[PDB]
């Protein structure tokens, strides 16, 4: 129920199990990654689609068992001055495989001269700060992006959906369902005595 609020979603249509059917199926483990990207790079992350910001950063493959949910929110995400905390990799060594990461504070070369402490014209930095400012356009705005991944058929399932509960009933036989025990019969007060593990 906390997945249908907290600002309108920029992209809630899913590419796998439906987001309305999370209650209907119980999962083993759920994986979430939290980062903010520019508004022009939201279209880059997609099943079977990549560009410059998508290939050199985390990539979402065609098969994911999950999808992406993003929303627009500017409360502590955009700065009127500078925003150097949020950086993107735009000059990488090679393609970045999915479910992998790499961090480097050292300059990235682009030719034959090995730059490992000296810079110049042919050597640049692989990192660059985001242009997150409210004075810019809509596509330059920061967007809170989270991706949900589900792991199935590898472990016992414990992340189950919220199964609702109803009110009491007495002396009138219904089609009850007590923790998976489905049956039909009256509900009367029991004179028996159980044990706490029973």
């Amino acid at each position: 129920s906390v997945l249908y609020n907290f600002a309108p979603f920029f992209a809630f249509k899913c590419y796998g199990v439906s987001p309305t059917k999370l209650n209907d199926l119980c999962f083993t483990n759920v994986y979430a990654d939290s980062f903010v990207i520019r508004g022009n790079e939201v279209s880059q992350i997609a099943p079977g689609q990549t560009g410059n910001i998508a290939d050199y950063n985390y990539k979402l493959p065609d098969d994911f068992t999950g999808c992406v949910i993003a929303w627009n929110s500017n409360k502590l995400d955009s700065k009127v001055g500078g925003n150097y905390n949020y950086r993107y990799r735009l000059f990488r060594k090679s393609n970045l495989k999915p479910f992998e990461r790499d961090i480097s504070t050292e300059i990235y070369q682009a030719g034959n001269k090995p730059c490992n402490g000296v810079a110049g014209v042919n050597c640049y930095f692989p990192l660059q700060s985001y242009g997150f400012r409210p004075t810019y356009g809509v596509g330059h705005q920061p967007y809170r992006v989270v991706v949900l991944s589900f792991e199935l058929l590898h472990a016992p399932a414990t992340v189950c959906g919220p199964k609702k509960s109803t009110n009491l009933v007495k002396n009138k036989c219904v089609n009850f369902n007590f923790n998976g025990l489905t049956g039909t019969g009256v509900l009367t007060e029991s004179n028996k005595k159980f044990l706490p593990f029973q």
Partner: antibody
Amino acid sequence: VQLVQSGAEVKKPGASVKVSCKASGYIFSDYNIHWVRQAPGQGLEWMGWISPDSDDTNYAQSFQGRVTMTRDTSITTVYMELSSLRSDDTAVYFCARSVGYCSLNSCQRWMWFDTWGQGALVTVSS
Amino acid sequence: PVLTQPPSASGPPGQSVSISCSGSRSNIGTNFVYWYQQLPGAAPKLLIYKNDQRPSGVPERFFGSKSGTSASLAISGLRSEDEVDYYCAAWDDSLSGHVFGAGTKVTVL
């Protein structure tokens, strides 16, 4: 912006002083405040930034307990405490204003001191 | 990894001259190098940021560039009103703090 400095007296070693720079004239949740000390006979020294919305700081390998950096969002005024003043600590504490949040370590490469305002003169003697 | 700057500068007016600001290995080049100045008895300002473009409000006389460990400040013509105290600013990842040069004093010959 109102980057004025509050006056401080000369105190002998064995106590601590308070150096305050006014942070009004701009929003306190988006602009960073940096402090640089200029001492004659050597280069400038730089000890840490502040994040004026929460608790976040980074120290260099020059001072660990002499410099305490605080913040106040209700009054929009930062207060700095310097203890055990000496010839090494005798420097012009400059109040610098820079844009950017920079609560991490890889963001300070892209920062630069936009405006320097009303560097306080601090001295010390018995 | 301390920045190396001469204590005094010998700049003759009428011709160009280059001055150097060098650090050490993994000190200059991995991070951008800035040029800063301060008026005597006044708050400092910035001369050249990132050694790429000249900021607005400053005349285009000082040329900023980096050549490996050595950072060069190229000038074209010397004026009597441009005798501000020059300084070198850089960032190093081995200290997590800004390292500044010794400071170069420009005196007219």
